[PDB]
Design a protein around this ligand. Sequence first.
Ligand SMILES: [Mg+2]
Lengths: 125, 234, 167, 95, 142
Amino acid sequence: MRWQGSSRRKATGGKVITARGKRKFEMGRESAETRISEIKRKKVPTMGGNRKVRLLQSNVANVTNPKDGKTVTAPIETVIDNTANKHYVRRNILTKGSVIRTSMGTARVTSRPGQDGVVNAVLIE
Amino acid sequence: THQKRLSVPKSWKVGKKGNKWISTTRPGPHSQARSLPLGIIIRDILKLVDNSREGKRILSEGKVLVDGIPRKDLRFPVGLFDVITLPLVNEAYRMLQDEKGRLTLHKLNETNVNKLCRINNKTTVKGGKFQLNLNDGTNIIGSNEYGTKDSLILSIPDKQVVKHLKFEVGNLAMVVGGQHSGETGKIMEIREVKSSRHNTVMISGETDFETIEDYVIVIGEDKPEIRLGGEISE
Amino acid sequence: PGKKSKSYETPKHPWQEARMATEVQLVKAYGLRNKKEVWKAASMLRMYRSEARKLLAHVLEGHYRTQSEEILSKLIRYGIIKSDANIDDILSLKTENILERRLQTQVLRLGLARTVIQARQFITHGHIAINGRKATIPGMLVSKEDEMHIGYYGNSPLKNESHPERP
Amino acid sequence: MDIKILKDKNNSLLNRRELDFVVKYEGSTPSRSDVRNKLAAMLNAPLELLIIQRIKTEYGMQESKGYAKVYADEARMKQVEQEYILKRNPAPGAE
Amino acid sequence: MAKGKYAANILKQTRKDARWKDTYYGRRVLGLNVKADPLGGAPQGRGIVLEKVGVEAKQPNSAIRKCVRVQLIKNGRQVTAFCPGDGAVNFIDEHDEVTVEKIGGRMGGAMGDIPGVRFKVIAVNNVSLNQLVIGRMEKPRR
RNA sequence: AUUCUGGUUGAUCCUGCCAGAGGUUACUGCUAUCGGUGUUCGCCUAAGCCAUGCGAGUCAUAUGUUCUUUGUGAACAUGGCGUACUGCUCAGUAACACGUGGAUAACCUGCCCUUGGGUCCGGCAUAACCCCGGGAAACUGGGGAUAAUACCGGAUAACGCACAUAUGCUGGAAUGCUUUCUGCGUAAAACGGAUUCGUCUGCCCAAGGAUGGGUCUGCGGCCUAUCAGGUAGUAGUGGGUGUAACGUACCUACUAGCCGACAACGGGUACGGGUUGUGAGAGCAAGAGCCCGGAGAUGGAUUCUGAGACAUGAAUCCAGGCCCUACGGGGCGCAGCAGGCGCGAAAACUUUACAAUGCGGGAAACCGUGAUAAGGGGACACCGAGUGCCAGCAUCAUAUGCUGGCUGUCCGGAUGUGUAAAAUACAUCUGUUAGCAAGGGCCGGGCAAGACCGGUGCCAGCCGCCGCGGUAACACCGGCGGCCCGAGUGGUGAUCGUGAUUAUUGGGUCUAAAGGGUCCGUAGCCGGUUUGGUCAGUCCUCCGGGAAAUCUGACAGCUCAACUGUUAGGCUUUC
Ligand SMILES: [Mg+2]
């Protein structure tokens, strides 16, 4: 659980005095980070019967060659780097926009594993 | 899902008498703004049943049909140009918007008559289908001849196409809002004025003016193809 | 909310000597009971006067013709103004016409009772009717067309002409 | 007591006759059974079949509103008419 | 007080400051009347009578004005209350329940030749002291 | 009716307030017959605390079991839907909370809606029931039997990556749908129920709508400087994260911004608006009730369930108070309806019914409904009536007389209309010696009313203000009389008007309160004639809006009336 309601001052620093409680629709879940392990997923429910698939661990990827446009599933070994956080590279976290290392070759994750339910990585040219 | 006596919609001609709620219309296919309950229609306009229980009884016994469908629920919405058919008297009535934006009923002559609809968004269902954003009856998922706002006509109750009433410059047009509601007249110029809100249209019947494209109905080639105006019975 | 205040008005100073004298004279002449009855009659008078002022300010337009003719048609229906009257005649309107339209005044000047208060009690005690309606209201506002059909009630004893107090 | 009838619309959706009439009674407002007995002879409706919903008498003049009705079946009346109307309308031999 | 066309702001500001020089508007907005008076906007009250004083009148006039000393129960405020009418102190004594109301004089303050007294009795033991003064009611033994 | 009157003076003019005079609101003294209308009656103190009943329940055409009053009759269980809509309150909130115009191409939607599809194999628990109980209760154990639209497992999609493929909408506008297919990970349903076997209603699915709601921003509306700086997740960029979705909403690297002296930050206060009060109007003051949106459930945090909640009749714990106990433990919070204590100046019946209007339930018949309607009670607001009428006759000119009769609007009765059934109301009749049905203030001035008689003696008292009484009180107390109002009539606040006493309209500032000691001077504000160009304020006009409600007039209909509907106007404003 996290609160994603509109609570960060107004424009100036005058502390916004809340007139409403923490509503149910403003409650966001936890960042279920993904690592390189046994491929584990959970069918967490969301609004309107939309069970969003959340991934937690994975050592395989759907590496997509751009030269020929062929999709083959190759194992994930290590995150090469990541622009979003300099610590996920050390933690082997698999976020979107990171760069993983597969058997096919180095690839960049182009899918959000916490929302997509799979690790779809485009093979870097 | 309640609505009160005071906050009854502007398109609802029935007054502000009684005690709070007046027959909450369902979600339905048509907009709630231009909608009246079939129970309220049969209990106020036609005066075939006076109570709500007796109205629910007569609806439930398959005695009133809305485009050939005997709806058993007294909360069914009704949109503009809707036909209500009663075979036992051969009473045909059409939902119409008068000059003040309110919804009324005009009696028809024959029991069997078409119904007019409109095109609002042509989307593509997977399978090579040109979905026209239909809401009522059966239709034809057609081709690019069927454009937006084309105002298709379809039979009852099978709801097959009768004639593609495509609009052009000079063709007939019926207003569906504003201060010009019910002032049907020929189209003068349908200008595709680019703007962030929506385009515009030029229409002149008895008197010329400018009107919005969402307040125009392509109701005929040169003359009324459908039975537009019969008898205005309260 | 949606409630309503009074109909009549009130004097700013409530003990004007000549004004109170005219009030008592009108009340005693027309057989009224309350000062507020005269006040509300003058309030209808000033309603017609204020409508006349609002119309005569413009000096009659596509919809102001309707707003200026509907009041004249209603007054000719009720006859507070002259039959051959205009908009401007309402501006010179005194409250005797309003009191004349009162049914007690009408029955007093129809000779159905000797005195005005006897007309009051006859109207209230079902002795004045109109085409079968046993109306018992002194404050009833009638038309010139309403005036002819007025008579005793068929159930009241004065329909039989044996009343000694009756003329 | 006198009666004159004006509106006799028949609802096709229920197969019943709507009786609207003016009650020219004298003096005492007649009861529902008496007005039914008088209204029966005007349109050939039995007491069990002829039904009256109100004999509402106005102020002053002895005139009343009668909203009576006619059915082609007493079972149809029991299915459609409310139980208070069935009790209020005395059946032949009712108690 | 600028008479230019595009000078509504200056006129609004100068009307805003000049309004405060009135006593009534400033005292209404500042809430001095609610903060000051014991009844707090209540039209009448209810206090326990403690002591009875026949306070003297003004300088030109000469008289004794019977004024009970009453402490309110709603607020515990100690004030002085003038009891009107002939035989005024006969129907009120120590340790009573008496309704009190403002004397309704000058500016809502003390009225007539009574110095320093702003409240008046209107009823003793929830019965009208005016009728006791007249002689149409009798003092309860409570 | 666009209103003046007394008070400072020996007398005048006048500045100037005070007080008088009219609404409305709250409360209340005195007091009293009735009907109509509807959108009032624990808001102002205590959003204090609550005994008692109750307010949401329903499903036989989902499955299962025992009876019969043999019927959509009832009882139990599994299960579906609903209880997140109404209803109450008005603390918090000075805020995209709200009003209003757009947006969502940035999003979710059970019921409902139309078209395009599908509805495929199975598996077999556990209920009531049986056998034994435990338990003060709250609760609830074991073994035996078993079913479903219960629940689980399997096949044909959506979701995300990468691709190529033709305008399909909208259109500044793809970023969406997409013809798509490609391969890579990746799915549903109940061939259920009933039938007249005609069919009806349900499950899954795709597209869209509609409904519900989140988000978003142009603009509109408080007091305050005896409140000058505020802000570091604060302002922004890239990459992410989580979300229904956009978003510092959170995280990371970075930049050094952001708001404010044209009022930030803080304090004061407040549910916002539609509107209401008042006045000739400009305005000024309040926004309890009817409708729209917002928030809240003892204060507070957290969470399950669900399409939807952080749920008024859900939980959990803390604080706080209370409560049932067999002392091992177990509940509860009426800002839901009547009611109680408390509170105070400050307000009702623990009535009636699903008859109607609605809502959920059902396929239907129908059931529940302190929602709603119907009443009871409260000098709520408005409106309508009557307590008398009456010829002749007499004084002191309107009071009881003397007499003569006469009417039943009221009150009581009868009877029916009538409502779910009442009651009122409604019609005829009839009850009355017209008697049962008027009071309240005030009398020196302001101000309509007594210079009449005793009392009291700067005393009792009056008195909004002025002013009265230490000996002749039209002043004060009883009387006598008189006056105004009217089932009402006063009192104290409040507030509007008075008052041009806040003045833009519309005031003054030499001597009455008031020109700053002078002056220089920013924002602001005010600005020469003149040719040329634009048309933003402005101007005429058009088109989208500005919910109804309340306002005005009439018509129509309630007996007149207020009131409901139609309608022509108003407001909504100042987009
Ligand atoms: Mg959920």
